[model samples]
Target: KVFGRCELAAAMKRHGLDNYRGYSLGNWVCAAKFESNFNTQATNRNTDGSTDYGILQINSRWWCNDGRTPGSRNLCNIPCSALLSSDITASVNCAKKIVSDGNGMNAWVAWRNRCKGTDVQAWIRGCRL
Candidate 1:
């Protein structure tokens, strides 16, 4: 997990993840808040039988491995467990690629349902972004 918000922003900037496609770092930050609250080992089971991974809450349906999941996409070519690591380089890269291939933040339900058009400052409040 992140030591604080400053580390979160720093890691994002370091990975060239501050902004991509049409989304901003604040949106990413907000997504993290709603999805995982910055916890790296986070996971959630979907009704469709897929699981979300990491601070980004990436889905196993097209991005990671559920081992027993049939026809899993594994687009990132890394195990779903890798996304749960404290070092998020792989997860960050995968998320950026997803944004590159998909409709902006449309892949993230939390982003679409809660963060869209909303102010992003609160997620980074008191953090150096």
Candidate 2:
């Protein structure tokens, strides 16, 4: 199991967003917590034969596969999917880019508004970057 906040903060620092420091790290943890409860092997099936995978819940089929490899739809590289493989620091950096890239806090703010008393996905549509 992950050691929690301290380790997560170290990860953020290594990724180079120290400007956001604690707040950015906390936001990342909160998003991952709400998204998959920190499950490294989490997955969800879509009716279109696609799946969401890993900590940030990346959409595997659409984002990772080229259709030439069998089960490619089911396989994803950690870094390629988010930042760089084997680099959680980079993944968080990539997430930071997504969150802060002109979308402002619309997605997150909308999520907070809709998820007051329901499943997290209740706010997902409004939160996609």
Candidate 3:
């Protein structure tokens, strides 16, 4: 399921992403925009053989187990498929875990490349929150 801009923003807010882990709501939205374009089923195969799954583009190497990546950490203790659910609850929850992993929002290269150190508030434009 592909989410609209404000729709995703609302969902993320509901999941406590507004100021989650010192990152603004726009930071998450901005990262997700560049990572997967809000596509829940998005997947990217990395050069290291690890796979990124879902809208958050979580990696299989350390986040979720895809039953393929060697030395998978499965830190979230969830199957990679769970992140693809349209509900987005699992994806949001796992994202919190990712941010809480001490890297904050830097775990996503998209955030660093596109959202970091910018006026991320623009990412939430047209949304009232």
Candidate 4:
């Protein structure tokens, strides 16, 4: 259910994210939901014909610069492996930078409202943090 708590926590730490106290899970969950409908394996074609993939919807062409490994082009893509690696925090941070030059937290907050029908302040209250 959202990649399990231990795994999510590990991923968070790997990417230097704070707990919901500093960064609300509902906001993160909203990003995941809006990006790929919570489907970790999801992928999409961009207007430039590149691909955005996985739950956090990381751009495959940009993130997987090494190109798909031999015999793994179709499935061993960037976002897929990133999601499998539970690297949501990295994906999120990357998206944040692209969207607002590191100011996209507000956009994420807006996304949370659109996807979850709640504000970050309200959602933050629901967690033990």
Best by TM-score: 3
> How far does residue 104 in candidate 3 sit from its true spot (Å)?
0.9
Worst 10 residues of 2 by lDDT: 120-129
| Residue 123 shift from truth in candidate 3, angstroms | 1.2
Task: Write candidate 2's Cα lDDT for 10-117 as tens digits.
Answer: 555566644452233345545556555655555566687666545555554534452433355332333344422334653454455545556533334322443333
Q: TM-scores across all candidates?
A: 0.89, 0.50, 0.96, 0.50
lDDT of candidate 1 over 13-36, digit per residue (tens): 778776577677888878887888
Q: Would you list the rank order by lDDT, best first? A: 3, 1, 4, 2
In candidate 2, which residue pairs clash?
Answer: 79-84, 79-85
Better of 1 and 4 by TM-score: 1
Counted clashes in each candidate structure = 0, 2, 0, 0
Candidate 3 lDDT by residue in tens digits, 53-76: 999999999999899999779889
What stretches of model 2 exceed 4 Å from their correct place?
1-3, 18-23, 66-90, 93-97, 104-129
Q: What is the clash count of model 4? A: 0
Tell me the spans in candidate 4 whose CA falls farther than 4 Å from its real position.
Answer: 1-16, 19-23, 66-100, 106-117, 121-129
Query: What is the per-residue lDDT of model 4 for residues 4-123, given as tens digits with 9 covering 90 to 100?
Result: 434443454455544333455556655665666666566676575566666666655544432442323322323445643434654655554445445444534436457444663443
Question: Residue 105 in model 1: shift from native, Å?
Answer: 0.7
Relative to the unseen true structure, what is the C-alpha lDDT of residue 70 in candidate 4, on a scale of 0 to 100?
A: 31
Pairs of residues at least 3 apart in sequence or in different chains that clash in candidate 3: none
Rank by TM-score, descending? 3, 1, 2, 4
